[PDB]
Amino acid sequence: TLLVHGKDAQGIIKQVLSEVYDAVTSTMGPNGQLVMIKNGVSTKTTKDGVTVARSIRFADEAHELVNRVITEPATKTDEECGDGTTTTIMLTHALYHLFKDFPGFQHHRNIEDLVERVIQRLESMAIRVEVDDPRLYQVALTSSNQDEKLARLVSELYANNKGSYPDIELKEGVNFEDQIEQTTGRTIRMFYANPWFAKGHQGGVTELTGFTAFVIDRRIDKEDTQKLIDGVNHLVKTHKQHLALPILLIARSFEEAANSTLMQLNAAHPTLVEDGRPWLIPLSTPGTSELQDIAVMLNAPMLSDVADLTKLDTHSINGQHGQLELGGNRSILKSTTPKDEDRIEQHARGIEELLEGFSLSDKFSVRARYNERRIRTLRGKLITISVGGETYSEVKERVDRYEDVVKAIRSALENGILPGGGVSLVKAVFGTIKEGLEDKDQSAEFAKRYINSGIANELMRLSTIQHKLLFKDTALYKENGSFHFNDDWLNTPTVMNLATGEIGTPEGLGIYDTAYASITALKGGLQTAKILATTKTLILG
Amino acid sequence: TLLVHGKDAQGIIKQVLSEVYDAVTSTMGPNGQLVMIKNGVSTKTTKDGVTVARSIRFADEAHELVNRVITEPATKTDEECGDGTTTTIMLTHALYHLFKDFPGFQHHRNIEDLVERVIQRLESMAIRVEVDDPRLYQVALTSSNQDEKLARLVSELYANNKGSYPDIELKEGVNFEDQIEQTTGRTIRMFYANPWFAKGHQGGVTELTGFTAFVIDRRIDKEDTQKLIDGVNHLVKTHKQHLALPILLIARSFEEAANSTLMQLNAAHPTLVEDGRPWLIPLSTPGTSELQDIAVMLNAPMLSDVADLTKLDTHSINGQHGQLELGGNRSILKSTTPKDEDRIEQHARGIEELLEGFSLSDKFSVRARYNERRIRTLRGKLITISVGGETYSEVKERVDRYEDVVKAIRSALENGILPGGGVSLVKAVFGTIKEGLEDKDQSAEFAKRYINSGIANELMRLSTIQHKLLFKDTALYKENGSFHFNDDWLNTPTVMNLATGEIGTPEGLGIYDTAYASITALKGGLQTAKILATTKTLILG
Amino acid sequence: TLLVHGKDAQGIIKQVLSEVYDAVTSTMGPNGQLVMIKNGVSTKTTKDGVTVARSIRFADEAHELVNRVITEPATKTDEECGDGTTTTIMLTHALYHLFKDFPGFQHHRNIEDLVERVIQRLESMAIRVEVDDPRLYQVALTSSNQDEKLARLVSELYANNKGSYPDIELKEGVNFEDQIEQTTGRTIRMFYANPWFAKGHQGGVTELTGFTAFVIDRRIDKEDTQKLIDGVNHLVKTHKQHLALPILLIARSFEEAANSTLMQLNAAHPTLVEDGRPWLIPLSTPVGGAIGTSELQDIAVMLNAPMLSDVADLTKLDTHSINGQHGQLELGGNRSILKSTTPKDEDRIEQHARGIEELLEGFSLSDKFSVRARYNERRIRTLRGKLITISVGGETYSEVKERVDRYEDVVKAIRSALENGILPGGGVSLVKAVFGTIKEGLEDKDQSAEFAKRYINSGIANELMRLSTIQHKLLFKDTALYKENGSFHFNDDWLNTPTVMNLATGEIGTPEGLGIYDTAYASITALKGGLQTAKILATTKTLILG
């Protein structure tokens, strides 16, 4: 195949990045255009930044090779958070032109360094919103495409449950009206290894009022078949007196070689079978410390090896008499005694204490957010909303609109809130320039690198891009050719509510963004911009 | 694949909308042309708007992509009502030009708001015609191609049965004269799960003079096989004294796993078999509240779970001694005692009271119309007319002529009536402009948005389009180049009867349209127009 | 696929109609050209209008789409009557040019009404020929392509059998000479409801020497399944002593719901099965309407069957009502054929035939030419008709099968001649009908004011006169009628004594004098069908190829 080198590769990169920019940006604003996507023999018409980005294709192999670098990192890998895909592609294009404008390795190490200081300001500027705070409604109203009914309902659900963070699931209903099902119960990530072990022997929903759980770490296959026979028969023979059925063997993965062995082990002792219910259930989980949470909830001992089942005692074995609901998708706990809740809360505090002693940068990392996900599983309530409507298509669309509201409010309380309308980036850039210039200690170095170079000024012009796209062709850009920011506008910003038609501050009107989305957009935008600027060779072979 | 953006996309959209408009509109009027459609190795030649719309194809993928947005929403999704597809494509084309003529987001929100107020006028102008009202004869006389005998008979059939909406079936008779068979009986949506349960064990028409029905909600499969054995044997053993055979188990769906179980349960008690007839029949229905109607008709209790069959009493169990005719397509009730009719009428009033307390906009929704479909099932009589004539061909043609009359009268009473000839839309536009301008409170704002802009004036020109296509090349457009409306014509409109050849008022001559068709054409025309106007991107990958 | 709209659609339609017109019309006349058709690896050379029409193809889809509207209605649907396909295409082309010349919906509604009044004159002009009348020979001579031997033989077969109308079948013989087989046997319109009930259980030709028929009036479906079980088991149990198998249940229509029930009823009594033959056969008749009711009454009289209104009437029966015949019957998928009829039965049939004849004797002269009288005559002909089987011979194999087809054309012509009527040939009857209709409307002083405005002043009347001449022109151009001047023109005097030319002899005279006639049904249907297809082609503006 062909090999592209020199001015031609940098020629292709520029063209692809241009075409992707135009298609994704036109979506934004009050004059937001619509994109018409073909799928098979149907037509889907939308204005969703992610969906447009996911679906752009090119004919040439060279063009497509580049296209998988600008979209796909914020498209295929980004499965957890859908929002902030429009923004990342936007900043990539912006910062790419900054790198082309100040060439050479010495400038690049200065650009990368200033942008890194701006990121530190945005991480500081984040407003940590509380559960009771009414600002959640404004975030809910914006994310729901100006829904008055939905934004009221979801905001109330979090506000009424002051003390516990509600986990919300969605199902396609039957009626025209919506129906809410609130439950005081914990959701676990464990599920059936094989459908045979459930009630009715066909993957049903087995309800229990007593159990004895055991958490194994290893992935179980044909090699552990003998260790299970030695393990299970040890407890059934020796330690039967202090044992509440059924015995739950929670692990990472159960292969079909091991599942077939444990089916026969149930048949070996037919005396312990009560109303069809098998007395031994293998349970898989899709992350070592998630099983530690599973162990604490059900008073189960943590075991490394399968052969450790033999060496056990009354001190290690603890059979619970609560209430559990096993399932093919997930298991649900319900009845938790005051003695058990003391153990769970003590374990939850242990995770919280670890988060208290980390740096400010690591609080926004995957480490801290996973540890917060551990806490919420250990202390959470389940709510099931069945969404309704007039047709079939109107229901499933309303389901997606609910899911966007939930994702927005969850991340709002979790991560933070920043002034919307392309304002938080402008405040951060103008803040960091002023801070470095005003600080008389490093003012000599700061002026040489950024100010006198023209990097500082060029970076100010970039932050404006989002505010421009949002509020062009409106009454802000009416007085002159283009609106320009000053020192006063940083203290009291200026936007426009497109629904109402009024001018004010984002704090006054109520326009906000999720902090994690806007920060990741700048981090990811910087990395992808740098790669594109510094590529000189395309290999198609 | 290719990606179309900019002036090309709006260029493609403009062309496809043009070609579809020409092909569908040429059908309308006295000089109504004809379209010649190919299907396999034959030729269908028709002037049916829907059929033309359904069958238009394009060679290019870009062109076909857009074609699925203009035709297919009023073609593939519109299965309940065939009429009002020509009108919807007509208004789409009209309103698309209005959006291109007043560009920018600020104008668009004004257009959408004025058109919305026109819709509120048509919904108010609609004559909800009553059963006893003699205007049905005028609709019947128009639809039957000026039949004096047929329009009288069918109108009398509806008028004499004041209180019940008659369901009409048609059969090819034997005599010269027609013969009418009136029956005071209801049609139900239930039918056989398996052909074995019928008379003769091969899906026959089982006639009964007594039964004991039970309505289950759940979909029944292999999981409910044990619950049926426990349920059926409980009633047959304990509550046999107050039980009239056969026992009807009405539900949502019966799978083959459950049907085979209930076949064996019939064989378990051979003493209760009378003349071959199985004493237990499963009955499926293709909408939770439709089973509630089924429950009320047959004095059956509503049951959520299959296991609820065990916990039952003489208070809950009620065996009827009427007359029922079970069938593979549908079941038909006949003998209803005065005690039962009191229960049905009371339940029907409960549905009517719910409709009384809704908003005016929701009366034309799917919610209200489904609830009216519930009422008509609960209070509906079956009539069988056997159509006769001189030959064989004259009979089957007269059968079709009867069917068009029934379709017309049903839709007239159900939906509403409006003055035809493209007049009701002109009266609506000219009414709404006058109301807003005359109202001195909002006259200042109304003039700025609509009148001074030229929106109001341009909207008046669009309402004329249908009246133009219908009565061009005739004696209305004879005196001058083009006919123009005035203030006086709104009080006494002017059309032309194409059959007779006379000039008068639609009220005088007798030209009418169904209200739901004309309203939904404007609503659907507005949405599709807006989308086409605001699209800038076509993705073919 | 592509979409054709506007002036291009009307452009294609005009071209395809032109090519089909040229290919089919060239067949007609004394200078009648010949068409050479390719079929597989052989060559068929013919001057037959229908066969030319069926075989014309086009390459472009748009062209073939239009071609299926001009040919196929008078080609694929027209199975009963082959003749009058050349005539139908001819008039389509003519009336198409008329609709183009006077455009607009107001003109069109006037054209359709005038042509309708021409049709009414042709139906009035039809001469109802009698069996003994020698004119049938002239019709036979023209239809046989001037055969002296065949036209004599077939005309004699109808003339000698004065009283009974002969049904003629044709078979490929062995000898050089022809052989005639006359049989006293009737043809009935009943046939199998389902192929299972026949001999071999696959729609075969079941031959019987005894039966017990029962004629039901109603159309039978799923509603009558219980009434059949009660009915059949009543006769099989109670009245088995006076019952000759099989039991024939003749009715209007048997639906598949009822047929499946009667299959099981045969299986219920396996003792009465003889050599595979099912003892119960449902039999349908394609009639419909209250005119159609009385054809089943003929079916009832032939087989000594009782007339029954309802299916439930099968229960209340007795030895007086039930009558099992011991004749001979041949059941079939197309039609059933009776053969052996005892002198006792023939007395009942002739008495019933006289009852229909007496009804025709006491009606007015105008009503004798109506649908009522002609249908009642069709009843008589079925009740008194004989079966004749002619085995056609010749020198080779190909000469035999060609002569078979030439026989079939003569039979079809003479049948329809006696049935429908006779009109003066040579494109004379259409000219007489048009010139009659114009003169009648103009001379009638009551409606003369309106008639002049719509037709005469418009130039429609005069343009319609020019069209009726088209057939006469094609037939007698390049001959001594069109010799004195450039073109022959009709006058007032020629309507009283028309002028043609016998192409065989070479003489000038009147069609009545020389002996040139057409079947009335063919000429009427050509005008009706030509008008409908012409209207469609003129008013089409769009072609969808997807």
Side-chain angles (χ1 to χ4, degrees), chain A residues 19 22-23 26 30-38 40-43 45 52 55-59 174-177 202 390-391 473-474 498, chain B residues 2-3 5 13 61 64-66 68-69 104-105 109 287-288 362 365-367 370-371 531-541:
Chain A
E19 289 182 73
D22 296 316
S26 62
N31 295 48
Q33 311 306 314
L34 232 50
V35 183
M36 210 169 266
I37 310 149
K38 192 168 86 69
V41 284
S42 301
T43 301
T45 316
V52 180
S55 58
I56 302 149
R57 290 285 95 88
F58 290 93
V174 285
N175 300 120
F176 302 94
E177 66 189 329
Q202 278 183 42
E390 292 179 351
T391 61
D473 312 319
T474 192
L498 303 172
Chain B
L2 205 67
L3 165 67
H5 186 88
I13 289 157
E61 290 185 329
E64 184 58 42
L65 174 66
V66 185
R68 290 170 210 146
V69 201
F105 90 102
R109 203 180 54 86
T288 52
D362 295 314
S365 187
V366 187
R367 193 208 288 269
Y370 165 71
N371 287 27
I531 283 165
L532 293 162
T534 201
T535 297
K536 290 297 179 291
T537 320
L538 307 169
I539 300 172
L540 306 170

Side-chain angles (χ1 to χ4, degrees), chain B residues 95-148 150-161 163-170 172-201:
Chain B
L95 286 173
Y96 168 88
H97 280 292
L98 181 63
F99 280 127
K100 294 257 97 183
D101 204 41
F102 291 81
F105 90 102
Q106 195 50 71
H107 277 142
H108 283 203
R109 203 180 54 86
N110 290 327
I111 292 174
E112 272 196 292
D113 185 39
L114 181 61
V115 179
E116 201 66 58
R117 287 164 83 172
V118 175
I119 280 150
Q120 292 305 306
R121 282 293 285 271
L122 281 167
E123 284 177 321
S124 189
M125 278 168 74
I127 309 147
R128 293 293 301 272
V129 74
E130 202 59 45
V131 178
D132 67 328
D133 202 63
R135 276 208 213 91
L136 284 162
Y137 181 78
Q138 282 89 317
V139 187
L141 203 79
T142 316
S143 302
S144 60
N145 307 314
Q146 304 293 313
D147 202 311
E148 193 70 30
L150 263 72
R152 182 61 63 187
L153 187 76
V154 191
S155 62
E156 281 291 314
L157 282 160
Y158 284 86
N160 293 346
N161 293 262
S164 60
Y165 291 84
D167 182 56
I168 295 156
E169 287 192 312
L170 298 162
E172 291 93 315
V174 285
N175 301 117
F176 294 116
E177 63 191 329
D178 297 343
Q179 48 188 44
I180 316 150
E181 292 290 308
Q182 288 185 339
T183 319
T184 318
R186 285 157 181 87
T187 174
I188 334 159
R189 300 168 198 180
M190 71 176 89
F191 65 98
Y192 296 111
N194 200 289
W196 191 90
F197 299 102
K199 180 75 181 286
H201 304 272

Side-chain angles (χ1 to χ4, degrees), chain B residues 32-50:
Chain B
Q33 303 306 304
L34 224 43
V35 187
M36 209 169 269
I37 312 149
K38 191 168 84 69
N39 59 325
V41 280
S42 299
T43 301
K44 196 176 184 172
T45 327
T46 192
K47 52 167 188 172
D48 190 17
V50 50

Side-chain angles (χ1 to χ4, degrees), chain A residues 368-393 395-511:
Chain A
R369 290 182 85 260
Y370 165 71
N371 287 26
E372 282 178 54
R373 196 187 169 181
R374 286 180 67 196
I375 296 155
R376 291 177 291 184
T377 313
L378 287 153
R379 52 165 82 169
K381 291 177 181 178
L382 184 76
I383 294 167
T384 311
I385 301 162
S386 301
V387 184
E390 292 179 351
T391 61
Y392 182 81
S393 60
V395 171
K396 65 179 190 181
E397 186 59 45
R398 201 178 164 178
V399 168
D400 294 316
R401 285 165 85 261
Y402 261 102
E403 206 181 331
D404 295 320
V405 172
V406 172
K407 280 172 185 178
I409 293 162
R410 281 290 292 272
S411 56
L413 289 169
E414 183 184 38
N415 293 297
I417 274 165
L418 293 159
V423 160
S424 63
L425 190 67
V426 175
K427 274 179 71 62
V429 170
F430 278 66
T432 319
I433 299 306
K434 194 178 80 192
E435 190 176 35
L437 171 59
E438 200 167 29
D439 178 46
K440 296 284 176 185
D441 182 54
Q442 290 182 348
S443 184
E445 198 69 55
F446 199 92
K448 286 192 280 176
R449 288 190 184 185
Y450 317 118
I451 292 153
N452 297 324
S453 302
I455 271 150
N457 190 77
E458 193 64 40
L459 190 71
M460 287 180 202
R461 202 180 286 171
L462 286 204
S463 56
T464 306
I465 295 294
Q466 184 175 18
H467 184 278
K468 188 181 175 176
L469 290 167
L470 281 172
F471 315 115
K472 187 180 71 185
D473 312 319
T474 192
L476 289 179
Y477 288 49
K478 78 176 176 188
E479 297 177 344
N480 57 339
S482 292
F483 176 76
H484 300 293
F485 292 91
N486 52 46
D487 185 42
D488 192 54
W489 291 139
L490 299 171
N491 297 332
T492 51
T494 180
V495 288
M496 199 173 286
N497 198 338
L498 303 172
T500 311
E502 62 174 330
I503 303 159
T505 317
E507 294 294 315
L509 308 180
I511 307 155

Side-chain angles (χ1 to χ4, degrees), chain C residues 174-188:
Chain C
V174 285
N175 302 119
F176 302 97
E177 64 190 327
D178 297 345
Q179 45 191 45
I180 314 150
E181 293 289 309
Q182 287 192 352
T183 321
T184 316
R186 282 162 183 87
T187 176
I188 335 159

Side-chain angles (χ1 to χ4, degrees), chain C residues 21 36-37 75 81 138 163 200 234 246 250 302 309 365 381 400 530:
Chain C
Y21 185 73
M36 210 172 272
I37 302 151
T75 272
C81 294
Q138 283 96 311
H234 186 94
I250 307 147
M302 291 177 210
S309 60
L365 184 60
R381 294 185 277 184
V400 170

